[PDB]
Assembly symmetry: C3
Homo-oligomer: 294 residues x 3
């Protein structure tokens, strides 16, 4: 797209503020940003806020979101679909033209770990180019295992294909499959989907801790067989809904857009790989590390 | 197959009748029928009754089915395998030769949303050519959320490949992935697996209603990440067994042959896409619409 | 690998012995062994003990395993990762060089049907070449349906690719997808992953019996849609954890590395195919048989 040649829009911070006990404002951008997805490989991604996946959003169960999208893309319209919300797609997930803004309001009544993504036709194109992310909705009533959790992180899985190539998007294997981490608390890492960052800079934890991971496989196209090497999931909440409780899972199957809350104990010092156990995907990038110290 | 050149057998209605408090007769055909699977694209399908997927069958838990297959295919044998039933495959799912009939009897003791399909070797060929469908077995004891359901429909997902091409069937990506709807009550639509009908003629509902969808992914080869845009599933019953209860799912993973009952509320007027969230499949047809009016 | 030309190391029996009420010794080899994976097709597999999948391991919940690996491969290092255990991957799943041994100790505190596999980089290569298997951890407290089970077997699903071809491993469809059975009691079959043995020599059962299958899909790359033709699963325990209970499932979705305990009744004499319902995989080998006699 001629109007994207040479474009590299610097990342813009997410903006959120609470405006009532059950109402939260969120402002995001759609913007075109170069991201290094593998060593030596730049992808001129379509993004929210200059990150792919996009910035993490966290709200409380029962919050109504008053969402603004500022479209900085000079030529392509963009939109927002939060899986967390109840909304009319044809009224509330509609396009925002280049250099314009739109505001949409809708409730997040269900706890969990939801995908968000651009909803502009062709949606495959917009997602595959990088317009995906996660919104976490915290349960009013928490999770039954909250008291045991010692540390937590967010991990997102996505694929990368040949750049902006609809034939490949539809018909081809992924070039890369990758994890990223999005920060929940100051000091947490905040990374993009790439083959290397979470190997070079592992997530951190201490011996004996119970770790919670909030996870989502945003696709676009693949399912995920999520596994932490050297442990077993004590507890799993499918989609992050506290009612959807499994125990003692080795591996969690995630559909495309599928989420979970998973919890596990790291018993010994060392480095613990985190994979999709579809090992072709692991080999093309989808291995993160968790470094556990005494 | 030379004996299928020029063959286009008109659709024949399903025949069912109850013959006892726990016994039901069902008669189907195997027949060769041209179906438009994408605009401008005819597939000379192998079918039950001239539909692909085949006609919907609904029985009650505990019914014994006395099933007759009339094979109208002039040259290929066909058979029937209902996932709902307990049967000896080598006695009860056996071939019916061209221009012959066979009758088989077996019980449906388990509630749910089951695949049915031809079972003739190579089964991949028979399924991929269109010999698939759904049988719903209604639970004696209903579902706990029956009182809240305002409207219901059946949706089936299948793939289409290059015509009658075993290499493609085994090794290739699907050409199309599609939804169809099969009628439960007079006035409901009854469609075949194609890329366009349920976009052109959306399923209908009213604002505020809780909708139930009976769903099955018949494959042949792909899994499905089933999602309704703009809502969250309040309740999910995996395989349609009332005991297999999930809540607050964004997306339901379905294996090949996998079913579910899913329920969700449409809160606002508008059009709600229904997808597999494996967006390569969505892009090659697997988007249906639900139009919600005041 | 020049040092593997002409190498065909005879299978070596697994060695296990209990050394305390909660401690068990296990010794395995890594070795290079020719296996006929399809009629006329030899694969010079990388194996544990000359089987692919490897030998079955069964321990009790709460057992600590003191595991020795003897690496007989003349040139490639190998390792062991049991999904059953809690361990430091970087200390306990480390490489054993050619012609050396290593011993590692770790607990199996969680009941279920776990994958084990080589953990040497590239792990895709080691798994795809055949270094996979199952460890069953028996629950202290059994399964609630134990009293109804009349007969049981272990089945494992894996894929085979072009020999030792990392491009194919990462990017290609599987050449074959296969079941094997691993013996639990004297007289049970013990087979390798191939397209034909469990068709030629079906698993055996008697009319009316409730059968339990312990199942795992070791991949490397595919998910599985596990189904027994002519029955419905009465009970399913995901990953073999008794708490993860489903009922009345037609088909069980298994991630890569995913396990289950599944139980079903065979009501009539005959032969019952056992498939992955991803029928492209079934067609490339993944059909086993269960012969049921009066
Ligand atoms: Cl409440
Ligand atoms: Cl692993
Ligand atoms: Cl009852
Ligand atoms: Cl969507
Ligand atoms: Cl206990
Ligand atoms: Cl089948
Ligand atoms: Cu309040
Ligand atoms: Cu308000
Ligand atoms: Cu308000
Ligand atoms: Cu690279
Ligand atoms: Cu506002
Ligand atoms: Cu967009
Ligand atoms: Cu979506
Ligand atoms: Cu609540
Ligand atoms: Cu701590
Ligand atoms: Cu927290
Ligand atoms: Cu291209
Ligand atoms: Cu793919
Ligand atoms: Cu892939
Ligand atoms: Cu702790
Ligand atoms: Cu634990
Ligand atoms: Cu616990
Ligand atoms: Cu626990
Ligand atoms: Cu529970
Ligand atoms: Cu009666
Ligand atoms: Cu009767
Ligand atoms: Cu009778
Ligand atoms: Cu077309
Ligand atoms: Cu009759
Ligand atoms: Cu047929
Ligand atoms: Cu079937
Ligand atoms: Cu019942
Ligand atoms: Cu109504
Ligand atoms: Cu009804
Ligand atoms: Cu061909
Ligand atoms: Cu496929
Ligand atoms: Cu596909
Ligand atoms: Cu209502
Ligand atoms: Cu609701
Ligand atoms: Cu409700
Ligand atoms: Cu509810
Ligand atoms: Cu429930
Ligand atoms: Cu003891
Ligand atoms: Cu001890
Ligand atoms: Cu000890
Ligand atoms: Cu062959
Ligand atoms: Cu010892
Ligand atoms: Cu190895
Ligand atoms: Cu593993
Ligand atoms: Cu226990
Ligand atoms: Cu018996
Ligand atoms: Cu036993
Ligand atoms: Cu090659
Ligand atoms: Cu594959
Ligand atoms: Cu495949
Ligand atoms: Cu019995
Ligand atoms: Cu039964
Ligand atoms: Cu039972
Ligand atoms: Cu039962
Ligand atoms: Cu239960």
């Amino acid at each position: 797209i001629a109007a994207h040649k040479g474009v590299n829009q610097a990342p813009v911070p997410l903006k959120m503020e609470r405006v009532g006990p059950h109402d939260v404002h969120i402002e995001m951008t759609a913007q075109i940003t170069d991201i290094e997805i593998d060593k030596g490989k730049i992808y001129k991604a379509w993004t929210f806020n200059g990150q792919a996946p996009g910035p993490l959003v966290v709200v409380n169960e029962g919050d109504t979101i008053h969402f603004t999208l500022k479209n900085m893309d000079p030529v392509v319209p963009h939109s927002m679909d939060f899986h967390a919300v109840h909304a009319s797609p044809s009224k509330d997930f509609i396009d925002v033209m280049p250099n314009k803004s739109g505001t949409f309001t809708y409730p997040a009544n269900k706890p969990g770990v939801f995908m968000y993504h651009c909803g502009t036709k062709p949606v495959l194109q917009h997602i595959a180019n990088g317009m995906h992310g996660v919104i976490i909705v915290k349960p009013k009533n928490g999770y039954p295992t909250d008291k045991e959790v010692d540390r937590e992180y967010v991990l997102i899985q996505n694929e990368w294909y040949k750049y902006n190539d609809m034939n490949d998007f539809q018909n081809g294997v992924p070039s890369y499959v990758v994890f990223s981490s999005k920060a929940l608390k100051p000091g947490d890492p905040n990374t993009n989907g790439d083959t290397f960052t979470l190997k070079e800079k592992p997530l951190l934890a201490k011996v004996g801790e119970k770790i919670r991971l909030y996870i989502n496989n945003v696709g676009p196209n693949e399912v995920s067989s999520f596994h932490v090497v050297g442990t077993v999931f004590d507890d799993v909440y499918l989609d992050g809904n506290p009612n959807n409780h499994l125990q003692g899972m080795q591996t969690v199957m995630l559909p495309a857009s599928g989420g979970a809350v998973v919890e596990f104990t790291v018993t010994r010092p060392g480095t613990y790989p985190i994979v999709t156990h579809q090992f072709n995907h692991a080999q093309k990038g989808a291995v993160a590390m968790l470094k556990v110290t005494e």
